[PDB]
RNA sequence: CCGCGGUGAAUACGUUCCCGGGCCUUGUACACACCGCCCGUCACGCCAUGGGAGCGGGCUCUACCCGAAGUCGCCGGGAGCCUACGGGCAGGCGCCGAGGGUAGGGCCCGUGACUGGGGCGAAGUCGUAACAAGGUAGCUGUACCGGAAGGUGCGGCUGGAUCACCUC
RNA sequence: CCAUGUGGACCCGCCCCUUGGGGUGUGUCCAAAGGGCUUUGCCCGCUUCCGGAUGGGCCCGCGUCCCAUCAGCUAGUUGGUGGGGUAAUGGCCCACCAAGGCGACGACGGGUAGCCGGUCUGAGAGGAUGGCCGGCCACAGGGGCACUGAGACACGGGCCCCACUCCUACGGGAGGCAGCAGUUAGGAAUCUUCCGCAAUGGGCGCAAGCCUGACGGAGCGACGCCGCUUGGAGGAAGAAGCCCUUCGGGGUGUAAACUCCUGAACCCGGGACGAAACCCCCGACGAGGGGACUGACGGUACCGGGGUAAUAGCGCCGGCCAACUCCGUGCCAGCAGCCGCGGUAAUACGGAGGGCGCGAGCGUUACCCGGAUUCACUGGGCGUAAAGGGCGUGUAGGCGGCCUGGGGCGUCCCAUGUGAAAGACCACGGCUCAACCGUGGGGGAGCGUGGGAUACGCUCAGGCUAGACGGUGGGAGAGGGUGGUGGAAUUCCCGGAGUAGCGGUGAAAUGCGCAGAUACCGGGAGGAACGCCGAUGGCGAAGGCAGCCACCUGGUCCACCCGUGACGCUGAGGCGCGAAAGCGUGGGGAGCAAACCGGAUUAGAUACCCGGGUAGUCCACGCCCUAAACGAUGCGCGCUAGGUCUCUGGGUCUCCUGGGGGCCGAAGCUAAC
């Protein structure tokens, strides 16, 4: 039994990418599905599409990387070099609007969860709201 | 530790331990010398080093090193203790200031002075600049 | 001593042991490096501390009696003052009350005969426990005997070496 | 005291409100003083009542250190009714009734501490602190108490007790500086027994004005901060001196000398802002206008003239930390923040020269923050470095899968009230600058009220099955407990047979043997463990668990998808389990074996070796609870290459899928291993 539904996903994407898999599956759910909507509009992952496996819903996240490199260790740079969880369970981290994070000096987002859908540091600030700081990706 | 641990039974702040048992803070002490012996050094170094017990105003009978090339302290002299430990003398952790009370500054010294209480010289003994 | 030459042997299975050395490997708590280290002991000194018969001082709870000031409550009467007699004042008694005394229990401040071991500090003492299979593998909980070191018992551990016991 | 009553107070009936708010009815109760002048006028005052103003009481949410080696506190204590008391609620006080109230979301106790605006530090988060100024509290010799009053339970008021010094014909009285100033004690340490009432302010008065160490100021202290000076230009390939110099010269150094220019101190003359009204006059006693007195600081600041070159020190110069030679000294004398430096070449001791730093100051000591991501929220850890609780069960608590809908507590947003002043930031301005001060401006977390959102968390309802649990059927196992049987071996006893030695050791000896041992055969008693299988294996939460058999019992894995429907993971405290040893009662006691008895080795052996031997090892019940109780690595869950060997279930079965044990290894990790 999972303890933190999201964190699970984030990680499942994290390791997934470290071994360069083409895409990984993760338990479906509105939220996660809305959380991946961002990683997708933002370029960290080609995309996700509702899929079934054994009979239970899952989400196929098609990871995105870069080009192969020159010299030793030719593996492709990472698109999601880092993807942490901020607001863990039993640690709820909600930030005001003036408390929203800047994240990797604009090189990365920070998915918030404001009472106005799931937005990113940008949007959320643009709309003028704050809320549970779900994660930080770069 | 879990943050819900840090919550119940938080973090213990770091208490300090004064390496200078000179009551009520106080920067200097007034004590009455008692025995002015000559303790030896320690592991690496060697010689004879002037030192002297001091019945402190606060009530403590603490040892004190006697700086300088030579001094005039005896068995009843009143003295001022500063503070600072010597590393070749276990037990003492305080210094004796000079040119203060029965404690007189060493003669002829010429650089230290402020340290080693010792009114500089007169140099040819004229105004602030002649010689 | 340096050198010359004349005559001219014996023996060597074999590397285990003795002295010196080369390579490889393992252990190491050693690295002016085993003509090493470290632990413990007895002796001289210094700093602090635990216990601690007994005493002194202040503070608190408890039981019972003693209880100032003062406010509240009762009286305030042919014997006190005032009274248009409605009543007021003095005074009296009482509950409460500072504090005090009696016996007992705990708290800390302080003095202290008697006692324990501690840490450190020059040069010394005796043993050799540990460190390399450290010459009885080591450690460990426990029990016992020993001034102490440590010795042996019982079970565990490897944080044990050595092609007995076979991960590097 | 009576009268009076716009009115107001109370009871009581009623209305509008809604806990003693407002309005009303008949009844009852309650006022008061005068003084003064330019006296038919007005000033002051006075009484009652409603309102404003200000100030304050009370109450509540929230926030406020350390120690659980402080864990239980509480009897007026928790509530209730009646009553007392107060301006008002109330255990605030008393009487009765009930028995409760507070506590691990730390009560009770000990220790420490006035709290805040702010200050210091810090990148921030945070830490440390709360002296000056401002707001709040509390105290005034210790303790208690009330009187008077709007207000006090009254610092320079009062009463009693205590201590204390003081007067006393001893019968009894008097005081309190934690007010300014001073004294003494303490101490490393903290000032003038000043001037002024001119100003701002407070008190009383129609006013004149009185009072006021509040305050405005001056003095002392480099205690801190800020500005100022000791001079400015010139002045030789370069004085003297002192230093160094494999001795030619380098250095102090343009530094001085010397020249010229300026001219703090000091002298002369002038000297003020801070001061305008209260009073008096006109006016109307308004508004307004006119008049006049009014300084502590001061003869000070400041301006004008003249005017002399006219205080410097202190720390360091091995590395951190910027600054190097020589002479002395010789593990001495001495340095030292850490590391250390000195035992006859010291850049680390002392002096000299030189140099760096800072400059009326510089060093030092103490303490706070920093560095210290060394208590880590931001920002750490636990295989071997300090760190996983011996294991489990489970309480409080923390945490919680999937879908939809209500709430919308959290959470976010907008408005608004609050967030005084000083300080802080910013702009502007004043004192010749600054320090310091004035004006304006900005922001603020939090908290209150109103409105809004609803993703995520909380709550509620409805629904699902991907967690979990159950069911069906199957498997392995030294899992445990109870009872019972089995063989080997050992020692002891009996019989037979049989001798002279056996045993033991590096060698030996003690020890056992002719009451005939050992060695061999047969039979008997007893205790303990249980070969080979057996393993590089298994099972158990750990400890731990192996002859076989039966029985009672735990857990667990798989196949089926059948049932419930999130029912879950963790787990402070509690409770239970927990090798060996040890302890208690009782039994048993073959072998072994602490202590102990001898033997031998040794320089000596209370030791390694040897021969005996007690507790003990054994079982029963009770106790102990520790451990290298080790994988030295908490539990659960999800995710991330493989290969190889192995145990156990399913399988289209030497291939794939589940559970468990080892090996080697991707990525990754690690200080390395
Ligand atoms: Mg002192
Ligand atoms: Mg001098
Ligand atoms: Mg001079
Ligand atoms: Mg040894
Ligand atoms: Mg083996
Ligand atoms: Mg009525
Ligand atoms: Mg009411
Ligand atoms: Mg910091
Ligand atoms: Mg007074
Ligand atoms: Mg006035
Ligand atoms: Mg007046
Ligand atoms: Mg200041
Ligand atoms: Mg001139
Ligand atoms: Mg810190
Ligand atoms: Mg650490
Ligand atoms: Mg949920
Ligand atoms: Mg809400
Ligand atoms: Mg303010
Ligand atoms: Mg439900
Ligand atoms: Mg079974
Ligand atoms: Mg559990
Ligand atoms: Mg036992
Ligand atoms: Mg027993
Ligand atoms: Mg026997
Ligand atoms: Mg460790
Ligand atoms: Mg099958
Ligand atoms: Mg496996
Ligand atoms: Mg490996
Ligand atoms: Mg690798």
PDB file of N, CA and C (backbone and C1' of nucleotides) in Angstrom, chain D residues 196-214:
ATOM      1  P     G D 196      20.617  78.674  41.665  1.00  0.00           P
ATOM      2  O5'   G D 196      19.629  78.653  40.426  1.00  0.00           O
ATOM      3  C5'   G D 196      19.739  79.633  39.418  1.00  0.00           C
ATOM      4  C4'   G D 196      18.836  79.296  38.271  1.00  0.00           C
ATOM      5  C3'   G D 196      17.411  78.944  38.637  1.00  0.00           C
ATOM      6  O3'   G D 196      16.671  80.099  39.004  1.00  0.00           O
ATOM      7  C1'   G D 196      18.180  77.379  37.091  1.00  0.00           C
ATOM      8  P     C D 197      16.425  80.410  40.562  1.00  0.00           P
ATOM      9  O5'   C D 197      15.026  79.726  40.885  1.00  0.00           O
ATOM     10  C5'   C D 197      13.844  80.145  40.230  1.00  0.00           C
ATOM     11  C4'   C D 197      13.760  79.516  38.863  1.00  0.00           C
ATOM     12  C3'   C D 197      12.467  79.799  38.124  1.00  0.00           C
ATOM     13  O3'   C D 197      12.677  81.016  37.403  1.00  0.00           O
ATOM     14  C1'   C D 197      13.211  77.539  37.806  1.00  0.00           C
ATOM     15  P     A D 198      11.588  81.530  36.340  1.00  0.00           P
ATOM     16  O5'   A D 198      12.436  81.698  35.000  1.00  0.00           O
ATOM     17  C5'   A D 198      12.339  82.894  34.214  1.00  0.00           C
ATOM     18  C4'   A D 198      12.632  82.609  32.754  1.00  0.00           C
ATOM     19  C3'   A D 198      11.912  81.414  32.157  1.00  0.00           C
ATOM     20  O3'   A D 198      10.633  81.809  31.664  1.00  0.00           O
ATOM     21  C1'   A D 198      14.205  81.285  31.646  1.00  0.00           C
ATOM     22  P     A D 199       9.497  80.700  31.423  1.00  0.00           P
ATOM     23  O5'   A D 199      10.205  79.679  30.433  1.00  0.00           O
ATOM     24  C5'   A D 199      10.489  80.024  29.072  1.00  0.00           C
ATOM     25  C4'   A D 199      10.717  78.769  28.251  1.00  0.00           C
ATOM     26  C3'   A D 199       9.602  77.736  28.350  1.00  0.00           C
ATOM     27  O3'   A D 199       8.669  78.011  27.309  1.00  0.00           O
ATOM     28  C1'   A D 199      11.720  76.707  28.677  1.00  0.00           C
ATOM     29  P     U D 200       7.223  77.322  27.310  1.00  0.00           P
ATOM     30  O5'   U D 200       7.559  75.766  27.369  1.00  0.00           O
ATOM     31  C5'   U D 200       7.470  74.965  26.193  1.00  0.00           C
ATOM     32  C4'   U D 200       7.386  73.495  26.543  1.00  0.00           C
ATOM     33  C3'   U D 200       6.324  73.086  27.545  1.00  0.00           C
ATOM     34  O3'   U D 200       5.068  72.885  26.924  1.00  0.00           O
ATOM     35  C1'   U D 200       8.367  72.074  28.100  1.00  0.00           C
ATOM     36  P     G D 201       3.732  73.156  27.757  1.00  0.00           P
ATOM     37  O5'   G D 201       3.815  72.083  28.927  1.00  0.00           O
ATOM     38  C5'   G D 201       3.830  70.691  28.636  1.00  0.00           C
ATOM     39  C4'   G D 201       4.069  69.873  29.887  1.00  0.00           C
ATOM     40  C3'   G D 201       3.222  70.151  31.098  1.00  0.00           C
ATOM     41  O3'   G D 201       1.945  69.588  30.946  1.00  0.00           O
ATOM     42  C1'   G D 201       5.440  69.774  31.768  1.00  0.00           C
ATOM     43  P     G D 202       0.796  69.983  31.976  1.00  0.00           P
ATOM     44  O5'   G D 202       1.317  69.369  33.335  1.00  0.00           O
ATOM     45  C5'   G D 202       1.107  67.999  33.600  1.00  0.00           C
ATOM     46  C4'   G D 202       1.070  67.787  35.067  1.00  0.00           C
ATOM     47  C3'   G D 202       0.149  68.739  35.818  1.00  0.00           C
ATOM     48  O3'   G D 202      -1.201  68.285  35.838  1.00  0.00           O
ATOM     49  C1'   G D 202       2.269  68.796  36.793  1.00  0.00           C
ATOM     50  P     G D 203      -2.352  69.218  36.465  1.00  0.00           P
ATOM     51  O5'   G D 203      -1.797  69.508  37.928  1.00  0.00           O
ATOM     52  C5'   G D 203      -1.732  68.448  38.886  1.00  0.00           C
ATOM     53  C4'   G D 203      -1.419  68.973  40.279  1.00  0.00           C
ATOM     54  C3'   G D 203      -2.255  70.139  40.768  1.00  0.00           C
ATOM     55  O3'   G D 203      -3.528  69.733  41.224  1.00  0.00           O
ATOM     56  C1'   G D 203       0.001  70.607  41.197  1.00  0.00           C
ATOM     57  P     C D 204      -4.782  70.669  40.924  1.00  0.00           P
ATOM     58  O5'   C D 204      -4.571  71.855  41.950  1.00  0.00           O
ATOM     59  C5'   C D 204      -4.992  71.753  43.308  1.00  0.00           C
ATOM     60  C4'   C D 204      -4.789  73.083  43.997  1.00  0.00           C
ATOM     61  C3'   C D 204      -5.535  74.283  43.405  1.00  0.00           C
ATOM     62  O3'   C D 204      -6.866  74.406  43.943  1.00  0.00           O
ATOM     63  C1'   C D 204      -3.254  74.824  43.783  1.00  0.00           C
ATOM     64  P     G D 205      -8.060  75.026  43.037  1.00  0.00           P
ATOM     65  O5'   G D 205      -7.679  76.570  42.893  1.00  0.00           O
ATOM     66  C5'   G D 205      -7.960  77.489  43.953  1.00  0.00           C
ATOM     67  C4'   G D 205      -7.276  78.826  43.729  1.00  0.00           C
ATOM     68  C3'   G D 205      -7.641  79.603  42.478  1.00  0.00           C
ATOM     69  O3'   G D 205      -8.829  80.350  42.650  1.00  0.00           O
ATOM     70  C1'   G D 205      -5.296  79.636  42.762  1.00  0.00           C
ATOM     71  P     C D 206      -9.992  80.231  41.554  1.00  0.00           P
ATOM     72  O5'   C D 206      -9.766  81.456  40.562  1.00  0.00           O
ATOM     73  C5'   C D 206     -10.541  81.555  39.373  1.00  0.00           C
ATOM     74  C4'   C D 206     -10.314  82.880  38.704  1.00  0.00           C
ATOM     75  C3'   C D 206      -8.865  83.253  38.494  1.00  0.00           C
ATOM     76  O3'   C D 206      -8.323  82.644  37.357  1.00  0.00           O
ATOM     77  C1'   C D 206      -9.971  85.089  39.410  1.00  0.00           C
ATOM     78  P     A D 207      -6.951  81.842  37.499  1.00  0.00           P
ATOM     79  O5'   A D 207      -5.818  82.964  37.615  1.00  0.00           O
ATOM     80  C5'   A D 207      -5.624  83.906  36.568  1.00  0.00           C
ATOM     81  C4'   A D 207      -5.298  85.263  37.133  1.00  0.00           C
ATOM     82  C3'   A D 207      -3.898  85.450  37.692  1.00  0.00           C
ATOM     83  O3'   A D 207      -2.987  85.764  36.638  1.00  0.00           O
ATOM     84  C1'   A D 207      -5.481  86.307  39.222  1.00  0.00           C
ATOM     85  P     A D 208      -1.489  85.173  36.658  1.00  0.00           P
ATOM     86  O5'   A D 208      -0.689  86.111  37.668  1.00  0.00           O
ATOM     87  C5'   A D 208      -0.417  87.473  37.350  1.00  0.00           C
ATOM     88  C4'   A D 208      -0.075  88.255  38.601  1.00  0.00           C
ATOM     89  C3'   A D 208       1.139  87.781  39.378  1.00  0.00           C
ATOM     90  O3'   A D 208       2.326  88.359  38.858  1.00  0.00           O
ATOM     91  C1'   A D 208      -0.651  88.128  40.872  1.00  0.00           C
ATOM     92  P     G D 209       3.543  87.415  38.406  1.00  0.00           P
ATOM     93  O5'   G D 209       3.658  86.297  39.538  1.00  0.00           O
ATOM     94  C5'   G D 209       3.963  86.645  40.884  1.00  0.00           C
ATOM     95  C4'   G D 209       3.477  85.569  41.835  1.00  0.00           C
ATOM     96  C3'   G D 209       4.351  84.337  42.009  1.00  0.00           C
ATOM     97  O3'   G D 209       5.352  84.608  42.982  1.00  0.00           O
ATOM     98  C1'   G D 209       2.067  83.702  41.819  1.00  0.00           C
ATOM     99  P     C D 210       6.691  83.727  43.020  1.00  0.00           P
ATOM    100  O5'   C D 210       6.291  82.425  43.837  1.00  0.00           O
ATOM    101  C5'   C D 210       5.965  82.541  45.208  1.00  0.00           C
ATOM    102  C4'   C D 210       5.303  81.290  45.701  1.00  0.00           C
ATOM    103  C3'   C D 210       6.082  80.032  45.428  1.00  0.00           C
ATOM    104  O3'   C D 210       7.118  79.899  46.375  1.00  0.00           O
ATOM    105  C1'   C D 210       3.815  79.670  44.919  1.00  0.00           C
ATOM    106  P     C D 211       8.456  79.142  45.953  1.00  0.00           P
ATOM    107  O5'   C D 211       7.934  77.690  45.605  1.00  0.00           O
ATOM    108  C5'   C D 211       7.327  76.914  46.622  1.00  0.00           C
ATOM    109  C4'   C D 211       6.975  75.548  46.107  1.00  0.00           C
ATOM    110  C3'   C D 211       8.020  74.885  45.247  1.00  0.00           C
ATOM    111  O3'   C D 211       9.036  74.377  46.090  1.00  0.00           O
ATOM    112  C1'   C D 211       5.885  74.575  44.298  1.00  0.00           C
ATOM    113  P     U D 212      10.505  74.177  45.507  1.00  0.00           P
ATOM    114  O5'   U D 212      10.268  73.000  44.472  1.00  0.00           O
ATOM    115  C5'   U D 212       9.496  71.859  44.850  1.00  0.00           C
ATOM    116  C4'   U D 212       9.216  71.002  43.646  1.00  0.00           C
ATOM    117  C3'   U D 212      10.306  71.076  42.615  1.00  0.00           C
ATOM    118  O3'   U D 212      11.357  70.284  43.068  1.00  0.00           O
ATOM    119  C1'   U D 212       8.221  71.107  41.548  1.00  0.00           C
ATOM    120  P     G D 213      12.818  70.530  42.516  1.00  0.00           P
ATOM    121  O5'   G D 213      13.408  69.051  42.571  1.00  0.00           O
ATOM    122  C5'   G D 213      13.204  68.117  41.508  1.00  0.00           C
ATOM    123  C4'   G D 213      14.545  67.738  40.964  1.00  0.00           C
ATOM    124  C3'   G D 213      15.058  66.333  41.262  1.00  0.00           C
ATOM    125  O3'   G D 213      14.897  65.550  40.091  1.00  0.00           O
ATOM    126  C1'   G D 213      16.680  67.968  41.870  1.00  0.00           C
ATOM    127  P     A D 214      13.968  64.264  40.089  1.00  0.00           P
ATOM    128  O5'   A D 214      13.040  64.587  38.836  1.00  0.00           O
ATOM    129  C5'   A D 214      11.853  63.859  38.608  1.00  0.00           C
ATOM    130  C4'   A D 214      11.061  64.437  37.447  1.00  0.00           C
ATOM    131  C3'   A D 214      11.769  64.857  36.173  1.00  0.00           C
ATOM    132  O3'   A D 214      12.076  63.739  35.369  1.00  0.00           O
ATOM    133  C1'   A D 214       9.906  66.273  36.624  1.00  0.00           C
TER     134        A D 214
END
